[PDB]
A paper describes a structure:
The basic helix–loop–helix (bHLH) family of transcription factors recognizes DNA motifs known as E-boxes (CANNTG) and includes 108 members. We focused on two structurally and evolutionarily distinct bHLH members from the bHLH-LZ and bHLH-PAS clades, represented by the proliferation regulator MYC-MAX and the circadian TF CLOCK-BMAL1, respectively. Structural studies with engineered or native nucleosome sequences show that MYC-MAX or CLOCK-BMAL1 triggers the release of DNA from histones to gain access.
Therefore, we constructed a nucleosome with an E-box at a solvent-facing position (SHL−6.9) highly enriched for MYC-MAX binding in our SeEN-seq assay, together with an additional OCT4 site (SHL−6.0) downstream of this E-box, maintaining a second more internal E-box at SHL+5.1 from the original W601 template. To examine how MYC-MAX accesses this internal, histone-facing E-box at SHL+5.1 together with OCT4, we determined a 3.3-Å structure of the nucleosome complex bound to OCT4 and MYC-MAX with a local resolution of MYC-MAX of 4-11 Å. We found that OCT4 engaged with DNA only through its POU-specific (POU-S) domain, leading to the release of DNA from the histone octamer over 14 bp, similar to what has previously been observed. On the other end of the nucleosome, we detected MYC-MAX bound to the internal E-box at SHL+5.1. Instead, we observed that the MYC-MAX dimer at SHL+5.1 engaged in extended interactions with histones H2B (around 280 Å2), H2A (around 180 Å2) and H3 (around 100 Å2), concomitant with an approximately 30-bp release of DNA from the nucleosome. The MYC-MAX bHLH-LZ fold covers large parts of the histones H2A, H2B and H3 surface orphaned by DNA release. The arginine anchor residues contacting the minor groove of the wrapped nucleosomal DNA (for example, H2A:Arg77 at SHL+5.5) are repurposed in the presence of MYC-MAX to engage the LZ. The MAX LZ facing the histones best accounts for the detailed density envelope for MYC-MAX (model map correlation, 0.59). OCT4 and MYC-MAX are not engaging in protein–protein interactions, and the additive effect of OCT4 on facilitating MYC-MAX binding is therefore indirect. The increased overall destabilization of the nucleosomal DNA structure by OCT4 in DNaseI experiments, in conjunction with the extensive peeling off of the DNA, suggests a mechanism in which OCT4 primes nucleosomal templates for the required DNA distortions to accommodate MYC-MAX at an internal site.
Residue numbers in the entry:
A (entry chain F): 22 to 102
B (entry chain E): 39 to 133
C (entry chain M): 354 to 432
D (entry chain D): 32 to 124
E (entry chain K): 138 to 210
F (entry chain C): 8 to 116
G (entry chain N): 23 to 100
H (entry chain A): 40 to 133
The structure:
DNA sequence: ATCTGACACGTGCCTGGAGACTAGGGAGTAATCCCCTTGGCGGTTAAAACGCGGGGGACAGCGCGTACGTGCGTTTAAGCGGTGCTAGAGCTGTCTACGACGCCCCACCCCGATTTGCATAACAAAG
DNA sequence: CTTTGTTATGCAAATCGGGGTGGGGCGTCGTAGACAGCTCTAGCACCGCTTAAACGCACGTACGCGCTGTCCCCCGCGTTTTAACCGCCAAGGGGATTACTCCCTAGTCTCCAGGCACGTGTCAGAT
């Protein structure tokens, strides 16, 4: 897979900004936002994969994501744990 | 008939704050997650619940960032948010 | 045999310690000529010597700090 | 294969507080994770206290201390009172 | 005979509907009235499904006795 | 506390709804310490129940305010974020499908 | 009598040496607050004195250097 | 007389280079005792416990000032205001 | 009975801290705001340090109680213990 | 008597910088450092064992904890060094 | 490493850090019921590596300041001028460490 | 005459570690089955993409005006060294109340049907 | 048009019962800590003297703040197009489980040496 960051469209970014209470978005936000999201995903996925490899499992489970997030100080409820 | 600019923006802010559904489509999100995962290790599989867990955290993360970004723009006496406001919020947060 | 081994190892350990005493003794100017300086004197005077030398360091670093401050003030005056 | 949860106890508490109110399964999953998180926090803090004081037994004193540290303000005050009450009544004849 | 039982339950359900309409009651009112009589306060959904024969025969047999009291009252 | 209890269950003796025996077991399996005091799981169960009741009460009120008879994740989010003590305790927690508070700033109007 | 007295004299001798080792040990930062053998205390004291000698020499060099720098700056100021 | 800001920059370099505590010790001790007194009376402190508090407190305030300074710059100002402190604390989540 | 020792933190002390932080100019309202922030910080650290001390049935607060109070808040301090 | 790593720090420093000393305050800091890293890894390894329903901590849990705790090059080098030390120990 | 000739476990592993001590420390604190034989060896190697890395950088900082001794200032510089260590120890306060000499361009003439 | 202190010899002596087995438990390995992930295909329609015209806000520049910085003289209390006092930190020894652990039995919890309301939407009337 | 109750029904949730297990007594036993006592560390209160730092005030001016004006570029809306989603299908693989088996660490005991100090011989300078 290549360049699926484009899967995050402007409207999707705008809608997230709307929950944040933003009325106006500059044209440079969309590119900056995608860069930030990519980094966030890499940090969570890298750890979730590390857990998965350690366990000798071929598949990533919700608990691997939860542990990956827990270590970053971001506790998640409702997905198990 | 046409609405004055900013009328809709307020409508959308109220509408999206009231609602709880995901804003990012699942299929392209899955493709993004898989693309990244393939860099760390190849031929990985994911449970559908693992993907949902990732998206939920990501949206909550980005919204929280936008809230702080908005505060920075307000502090700067602006309405429009710029990359400077995002970068400042992240720098203060310690990311 | 084990008793003999212990005797000689302890005998040598004393001699090794004496050599360490001499190495320290020779390094202290106060005991430079005192070839027969006893263990207790070497340790006591080594302690006193080191402490006086450490006190000298505190005096020297104080002078260095004052001189650095003076250097900065003189450069400021030239500016 | 059996999976344990606290959903039955969460349900009973709600039944006593708001007898006419039901709870969704998603809300229950959240409440279940809540209980597990608080349990770990207190048990973890109590473990640290026992280690820091080089003691090997955890008692109500360590837990009470952990509660005072973990909960803010009035919430802590009430939790301590309830904990004290439960133990006092439990050991009382 | 399950078919004979089905017919009996259908006949009651038809009579029940006729009684409800004749008395001017809603399906919700029937369930509320059963709550008064038995303590079991049924929703309109259960009553609707009973009249619509969407319930199993076993369920109709178990609820029927309560509905029969409703018809008498 | 309760004047008396007849049930053998330790949870009943303590006047609690939460399972004392399970809390005791978990404390021993989590290797938090070599030994766990008998009163330890009783105190802890009481605390877990208390906090549980506080959230459910607020969430139940939120459900009533929204004219709903069932608690949903949205109500839990509102219950926590509108309460200072709970918001501090769970401030870093993300609640699935909880949404956000309807916070509108004057500068936006 | 004499042997028992000799034992007492020897005990006192050792006690003075043991205390003197401790005082010397605490004088060297490499052993300060740490367990050390008699030989280690002497060896560290020996190298530490050599260190302090060249350290204090180095300090004097820096003092002489700063004094000379200050003299040059003072000459420019006046 | 030096142009304003000339000295401030000299002081910034001076204090960034140095490592000593900037808050006077006795005034700080009184503040710590005053606060501790509200939790329990007749408390005693190790002298090292006080130093531990000073070190953490100054490190905390200095880090906060650095973030405060960034906020002021973002606002296109040089002078830091309470508005900048409150924003920095709001983002940090204090 | 101690009172109003918050004044022990003088303007120069605040100015020096701000200067270390790279601040060139300070508003006159900073001094009061700074004291308010410091007081809160100390209350949170002290409250935990005292709680640890009380749990141990001690009357003296030790450096390790401060270290644990700080570590607990995500601010690990080195040089005073571990 | 209290335990510390100051004797080992002294030896490591001597091997890296034969003509550089260390202050007592710096040494206190290094001891805080070692104890902090130890706790982080030991704690993380404990969590990993718990998550996988294991009762024994081995080099695999520690290696995993290192990958999780250390960033960038440090994780890469620490793992290589750890693996090397165990390999030598096993054959020693 | 190339060879081993020792009885001491630390020497067999080629480490300066005490393997036997680490082994005891792993048992302490109830980290696990059991500890693998190679566990303390792997961990000791990691602790030594990181220790050496900081000391090397701090020693270089000492030379830059013409010092023959490492002080807390040097440790602070060694960490804050290194991205990997800064991320690892970014939350750590170092006694008398001071701060980096960073001044913003907008404040300068 | 003998006393004091010194080096040096005989030999126990504490502890710290590693070495050697040893049983019982954990973890590794192999087999098997079935749920759940991946992947594909067609239809449809909600959302994304794109162009454009207007107006609202970003931004540069200008002028005050006052709040903040910088000296300078004077006051205050921080800091240092020294004295004396005792509360309580820290250690050790005794001894018992208490929690681990093995074993047994049944009332309580899990999960699979199974019944039954909740929220939303189709189907009419009323001002 | 806008407002409102009647009944329909898809589907998630509350309830029922049957059976499997882990909670709770009960007794036993080893030891963790509760408690008393004692030493002596360092924390606190006080004092006097020195002097650097803190305080108050005069005096300019650098920078914050308010206003004007211009012009970029973001919003809202209409129209086209493009993948997301939904429903359905099958393939297989890997995750969970159960049953062996072997090896590896907690546990206990053995013992070796490396610094350490008690106790004895002695040898020259000092009372």
């Amino acid at each position: 897979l290549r360049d699926n960051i484009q899967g995050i469209t402007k409207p999707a970014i705008r809608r997230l900004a709307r929950r944040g209470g933003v009325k106006r978005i500059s044209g440079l936000i969309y590119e900056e936002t995608r860069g930030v999201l990519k980094v966030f995903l890499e940090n969570v996925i890298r750890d979730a994969v590390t857990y998965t490899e350690h366990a000798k499992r071929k598949t990533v489970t919700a608990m691997d994501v939860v542990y990956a997030l827990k270590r970053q100080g971001r506790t998640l409820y409702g997905f198990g744990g | 008939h046409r609405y004055r600019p900013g009328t809709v923006a307020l409508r959308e802010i109220r509408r999206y704050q009231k609602s709880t559904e995901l804003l990012i489509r699942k299929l392209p999100f899955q493709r993004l997650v898989r693309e990244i995962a393939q860099d760390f290790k190849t031929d990985l599989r994911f449970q559908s619940s693992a993907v949902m867990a990732l998206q939920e955290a990501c949206e909550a993360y980005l919204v929280g960032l936008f809230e702080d970004t908005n505060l920075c723009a307000i502090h700067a006496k602006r309405v429009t948010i710029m990359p400077k406001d995002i970068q400042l919020a992240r720098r203060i947060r310690g990311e | 045999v084990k008793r003999r081994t212990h005797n000689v190892l302890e005998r040598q350990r004393r001699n090794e310690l004496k050599r360490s005493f001499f190495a320290l003794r020779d390094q202290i100017p106060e005991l430079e000529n005192n070839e027969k300086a006893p263990k207790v004197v070497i340790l006591k005077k080594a302690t006193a010597y080191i402490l006086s030398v450490q006190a000298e360091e505190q005096k020297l670093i104080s002078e260095e700090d004052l001189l650095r401050k003076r250097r900065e003030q003189l450069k400021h005056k030239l500016e | 294969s059996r999976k344990e949860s606290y959903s039955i106890y969460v349900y009973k508490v709600l039944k006593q507080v708001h007898p006419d109110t039901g709870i969704s399964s998603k809300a229950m999953g959240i409440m279940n994770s809540f209980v597990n998180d608080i349990f770990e926090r207190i048990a973890g803090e109590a473990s640290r206290l026992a280690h820091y004081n080089k003691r090997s037994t955890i008692t109500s004193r360590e837990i009470q201390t952990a509660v005072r540290l973990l909960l803010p303000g009035e919430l802590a005050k009430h939790a301590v009172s309830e904990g004290t009450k439960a133990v006092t009544k439990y050991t009382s004849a | 005979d399950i078919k004979a039982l089905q017919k009996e339950l259908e006949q009651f359900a038809k009579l029940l509907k006729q009684k409800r309409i004749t008395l001017g009651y809603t399906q919700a009112d029937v369930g509320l009235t059963l709550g008064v009589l038995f303590g079991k306060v049924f929703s309109q959904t259960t009553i609707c499904r009973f009249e619509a024969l969407q319930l199993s025969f076993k369920n109709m047999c178990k609820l029927r006795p309560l509905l029969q009291k409703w018809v008498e009252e | 506390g309760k004047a008396r209890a007849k049930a053998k269950t330790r949870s009943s003796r303590a006047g609690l709804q939460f399972p004392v025996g399970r809390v005791h077991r978990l404390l021993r399996k989590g290797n938090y310490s070599e030994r766990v005091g008998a009163g330890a799981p009783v105190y802890l169960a009481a605390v877990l129940e208390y906090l549980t009741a506080e959230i459910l009460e607020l969430a139940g009120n939120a459900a009533r305010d929204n004219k709903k008879t069932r608690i949903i994740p949205r109500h839990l989010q509102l219950a926590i974020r509108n309460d200072e003590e709970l918001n501090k305790l769970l401030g870093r927690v993300t609640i699935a499908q909880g949404g956000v508070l309807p916070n509108i700033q004057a500068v936006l109007l | 009598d004499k042997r028992a007295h000799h034992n007492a004299l020897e005990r006192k001798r050792r006690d003075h040496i043991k205390d003197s080792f401790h005082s010397l040990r605490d004088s060297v930062p490499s052993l300060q607050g740490e367990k050390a053998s008699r030989a280690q205390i002497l060896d560290k004291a020996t190298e530490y004195i050599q260190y302090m000698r060249r350290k204090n020499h180095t300090h004097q060099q820096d003092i002489d250097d700063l004094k000379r720098q200050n003299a040059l700056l003072e000459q420019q100021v006046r």
